[PDB]
Amino acid sequence: DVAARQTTEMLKVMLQQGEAMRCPQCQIVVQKKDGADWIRCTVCHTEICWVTKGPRWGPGGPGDTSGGCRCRVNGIPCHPSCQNCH
Amino acid sequence: TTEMLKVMLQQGEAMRCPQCQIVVQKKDGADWIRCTVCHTEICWVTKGPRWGPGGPGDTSGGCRCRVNGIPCHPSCQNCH
Amino acid sequence: MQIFVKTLTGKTITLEVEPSDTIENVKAKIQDKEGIPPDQQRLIFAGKQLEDGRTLSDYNIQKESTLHLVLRLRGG
Ligand SMILES: [Cl-]
Ligand SMILES: [Zn+2]
Ligand SMILES: [Zn+2]
Ligand SMILES: [Zn+2]
Ligand SMILES: [Zn+2]
Ligand SMILES: [Zn+2]
Ligand SMILES: [Zn+2]
């Protein structure tokens, strides 16, 4: 059972350092390897804004700015370090 | 032939119907098949019943595709 | 024997393995069962990322042990 706690602690550290997050739709743990400021979840196909660690879009999917990070709505990037979160 | 059917089942190109247990061959391209004998709906991409015993719509069993926005399998395009 | 792999929050899959199976073998069983390419899989046990060439034995992974699956995905 010491195993379980070592893994819980490792994940906690990954989350805190920004190396991992939970997919906001299906809740699997995801990491980003290289590339731009976004990823697509393999399990559920949700687009994830990595630079804000949250969904790129609202529940209508790509194009739906009723939720998500709303990058560039009214011309305002979602985060000052964003280069391309799709 | 029956000998080739034995191999398809062996290799996963066929499955047994989850309701009636008869051999069902793959429909290439499709993630869903309707059994020709008992007419039940099969999720081919997860190789199981599409629905619970209540029939279409009953997510008390089956693959539960799209419940809470989660597809039944990462490769699923449409299992009805 | 059997081992468990945590996937979505609260969800676990069960796998049929041998003490001698390699990590690459396990990731192949995950792909067969869940559809996740092995190059996207990172497996963790007891706080360590598992290396593809070692075996359940090397990592002291026994029956009813639980691994955690993490998806490693390329940025767009
Ligand atoms: Cl999306
Ligand atoms: Zn997801
Ligand atoms: Zn964004
Ligand atoms: Zn952005
Ligand atoms: Zn049938
Ligand atoms: Zn399905
Ligand atoms: Zn489906």
Author numbering:
A (entry chain A): 425 to 510
B (entry chain B): 431 to 510
C (entry chain C): 1 to 76
The article reads:
HOIL-1 is a RING-between-RING-family E3 ubiquitin ligase and a component of the linear ubiquitin chain assembly complex. RBR E3 ubiquitin ligases like HOIL-1 catalyse ubiquitination in a two-step mechanism where ubiquitin is first transferred from the E2 active site Cys to the E3 active site Cys before being transferred to the substrate. Here, we show that HOIL-1 is unable to ubiquitinate lysine but can efficiently ubiquitinate serine and a variety of model and physiologically relevant di- and monosaccharides in vitro. We identify a critical catalytic histidine residue, His510, in the flexible catalytic site of HOIL-1 that enables this O-linked ubiquitination and prohibits ubiquitin discharge onto lysine sidechains.
First, we attempted to crystallise the HOIL-1 (C460A) RING2 domain with His-ubiquitin-maltose to obtain insights into how HOIL-1 may ubiquitinate maltose. We crystallised HOIL-1 RING/ubiquitin-maltose under the same conditions as HOIL-1 RING2/ubiquitin and successfully determined the X-ray structure to 1.7 Å resolution. As with the HOIL-1 RING2/ubiquitin structure, the crystallographic asymmetric unit contains two HOIL-1 RING2 molecules and one ubiquitin molecule bound in the donor ubiquitin site of one HOIL-1 RING2 domain. Although we can resolve the ubiquitin C terminus, we do not observe clear electron density for the ubiquitin-conjugated maltose molecule and therefore were unable to build the maltose molecule into the model, despite intact mass spectrometry confirming that the vast majority of the ubiquitin in crystals grown under identical conditions is conjugated to maltose. This suggests that maltose does not form specific stable interactions with the HOIL-1 RING2 domain, in line with the broad substrate specificity we observe for HOIL-1 in vitro. (D) Intact mass spectrometry analysis of redissolved crystals taken from two different crystallisation drops shows that most (>75%) of ubiquitin present in the crystals is conjugated to maltose. (A, B, C) Electron density maps of the ubiquitin C terminus (pink sticks; Gly76 modelled in two conformations, (A, B)) in the HOIL-1 (green sticks) active site lack clear density for the maltose molecule.
